[PDB]
């Protein structure tokens, strides 16, 4: 399971 991979602002 992955960490927070959402793109940064």
């Amino acid at each position, epitope marked *: *399971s*992955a*960490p*927070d*991979t*959402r*793109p*940064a*602002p």
Partner: antibody, heavy 117, light 109 residues
Framework: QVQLQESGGGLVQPGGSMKLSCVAS????????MNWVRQSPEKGLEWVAE??????????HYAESVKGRFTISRDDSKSSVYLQMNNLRAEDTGIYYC????????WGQGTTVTVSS | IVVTQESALTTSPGETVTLTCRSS?????????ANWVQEKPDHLFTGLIG???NRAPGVPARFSGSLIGDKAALTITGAQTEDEAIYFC?????????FGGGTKLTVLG
């Protein structure tokens, strides 16, 4: 401009309890997970806790050394993340930072927590 | 789990340096989502790389993350004097992170 700003650090005796606060600004705090990471002389950087998004039910994970004594939580209404520390030990002494975004791009200035009898 | 980095490295400005980061459990892979964090004098921390090779926003193009052999690595191409600082790497193990000891970087200024 993004800014993370911790708060609530202080001196405490073993057995003590305190709550740290971190307020984020300059970006959509609600969109990212937040973590607490502490810096101590004897230990360098040590990850302490993470908290995910509202849509993750505010799910959390903790380092084994902190499990059962620390609790991370967030309030997106306030753009803030927090760390409630209980049953503090001298080994918990250190500078505590909230940090997040891909996966530690942002770090606050840190708040010192000293646990000493 | 123990994450190991080089204690210190020295470089003249304009040269390239690579710092590595190993895991005591085995090879570092993309699943460890290796991060690289920079500490400048006064406890100023800033993330450089996340997810192995994704450079954080605003971070200079001269910084690159990668995987070399069984380790994660940070490469600074054409290092500048402003890069003298300490560099930490952090590795993800399914549901927790372990940070390395930090590498002090000197860029002879």
């Amino acid at each position: 401009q993004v800014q993370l700003q911790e708060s609530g650090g202080g001196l405490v005796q073993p057995g003590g309890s305190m709550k740290l606060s971190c307020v984020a600004s300059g970006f959509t705090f609600s969109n990212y997970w937040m973590n607490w990471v502490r810096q101590s002389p004897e230990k360098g950087l040590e990850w302490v806790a993470e908290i995910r998004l509202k849509s993750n039910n505010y799910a959390t994970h903790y380092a084994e050394s902190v499990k059962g004594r620390f609790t991370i939580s967030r309030d997106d209404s306030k753009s803030s993340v927090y760390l409630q520390m209980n049953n503090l030990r001298a080994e918990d002494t250190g500078i505590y930072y909230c940090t997040g975004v891909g996966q530690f791009a942002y770090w606050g200035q840190g708040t010192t927590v000293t646990v000493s009898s | 789990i123990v994450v190991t980095q080089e204690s210190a490295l020295t470089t003249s400005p304009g040269e390239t340096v690579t710092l590595t980061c190993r895991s005591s459990t085995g090879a570092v892979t993309t699943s460890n989502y290796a991060n690289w964090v920079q500490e400048k004098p006064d406890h100023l921390f800033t993330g450089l790389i996340g997810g192995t090779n994704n450079r954080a926003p605003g971070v200079p193009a001269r910084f690159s993350g990668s995987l070399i052999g069984d380790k994660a690595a940070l490469t600074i191409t054409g290092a500048q004097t402003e890069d003298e600082a300490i560099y930490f790497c952090a590795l993800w193990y399914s549901n927790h992170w372990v940070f390395g000891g930090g590498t002090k970087l000197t860029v002879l200024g």
